[model samples]
Target: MDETGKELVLALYDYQEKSPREVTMKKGDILTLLNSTNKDWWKVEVNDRQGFVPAAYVKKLD
Candidate 1:
């Protein structure tokens, strides 16, 4: 269960107390998380938009 293989349970937009935006990721979508911040943040690309998501919500697939 690493960053490369994970299933998207939900897609939250404007995360981390940021302004709420529409998250384009679909449920059960498989994505490769390229990197993450030490603060439990993840960097990802969804629907051509690049942003960060809290690591707690995503589950890495085995």
Candidate 2:
């Protein structure tokens, strides 16, 4: 959960970079949405790490 106490299951593929604070995941992986303060991109949490992902690649798991 980002600022608000809401949990969102995001099914997106995030593999390519291993930056200091980047969230990486394989295809068909599920992550937690951290913040939705942006349009083109959004902050998310994956594998205990946080990073920004393209909003176009994100989707609801339920």
Candidate 3:
């Protein structure tokens, strides 16, 4: 994704591997993402916490 202007696709949660706390996303949830060196991982904000996600999961609206 281009860093020029990007927005959240969904609110995400960071979960422990194989843990039940893993969150599933829904439409219209708010998030904030940050730039990353890795093409796949991008920082995202979910509620009060932040985490990383695959860039492929997000789409540029504009």
Candidate 4:
């Protein structure tokens, strides 16, 4: 799970908050994965902030 420069797509996280702090993402927003790890929560970066996003909300990119 090498997420360095890894990009994953996110669904409507705002619709359902899986985390205590939900990350805002659009339908087509591409998340720049900061760290690589296999866990329920992934450290991701969007815009100018960083936080944990539910792995379920992250769609693997081909």
Candidate 5:
């Protein structure tokens, strides 16, 4: 069994990146989570683009 949480998630809201280091994501966007070090902003990859996104914007899989 896996001990750590799943690395995939489903985006719940549309987020527009305000900075170059951030990434945008629309509702229902599938994201590959890279890191969750920050509670507010988590690192993810979507559409081959990697950047930071608001942690609340996604829903972690069970």
Candidate 6:
């Protein structure tokens, strides 16, 4: 499979760590999407950190 299923995603809002499973994000942060097993959350990677972020907070980047 290709990692190109989705090219990238851009964070449009800042997210603070509210739980151990969440990753911190800043506005304009670019992320690598790892999974979307849950509709409300997306698994992502940024700055070598991996965790979940609300799907609504990000948009797909072409």
**lDDT (Cα, tens digit) per residue for candidate 5, span 1-62:** 11253477777898878877686888887777777677798877767677887888778763
Per-model TM-score, in order, reads 0.47, 0.68, 0.46, 0.58, 0.75, 0.74
C-alpha lDDT (0 to 100) for residue 39 of candidate 1: 33
Q: lDDT scores for all predictions? A: 0.47, 0.67, 0.47, 0.59, 0.74, 0.73
- Residue-pair clashes per prediction, in order, are 0, 0, 0, 0, 0, 0
- State candidate 3's TM-score: 0.46
Please rank every candidate by TM-score, starting with the best.
Answer: 5, 6, 2, 4, 1, 3
Q: Compute the lDDT of residue 34 as modeled in candidate 4.
A: 56
lDDT value for model 5: 0.74
| Tens-digit per-residue lDDT, 1-62, candidate 1 | 23653433344332433423222344445444545443366665566554555566565552
Model 1 alpha-carbon drift over 4 Å, by segment: 1-24
Which one is best on TM-score? 5
| Top candidate when judged by lDDT against the true structure | 5
- 1 against 5, candidate with superior TM-score: 5
Least accurate stretch of 10 residues (summed lDDT) in model 5?
1-10
Once fitted onto the true fold, the runs of candidate 6 whose alpha carbons sit more than 4 angstroms away are: 1-7
User: Which portions of model 4 show Cα errors greater than 4 Å?
Assistant: 1-5, 12-22
lDDT per residue (tens digit) for residues 1-62 in model 2: 59982455554665665675556656677777778677576788876778876667767674
**Residue 25, model 4: Cα distance from true site in angstroms:** 1.9
How many steric clashes does model 4 contain?
A: 0
Q: List the residue pairs that clash in candidate 3.
A: none
Residue-wise lDDT of candidate 6 within 1-62, one digit each (tens)? 22443446778799886876686788888877777666588877767677887788888764
Question: lDDT score, residue 47, model 2?
Answer: 69
Question: In model 3, which runs have C-alpha deviations exceeding 4 angstroms?
Answer: 1-24, 27-30
Q: Rank by lDDT, highest first.
A: 5, 6, 2, 4, 1, 3
Look at candidate 6 and tell me the lDDT of residue 58: 81
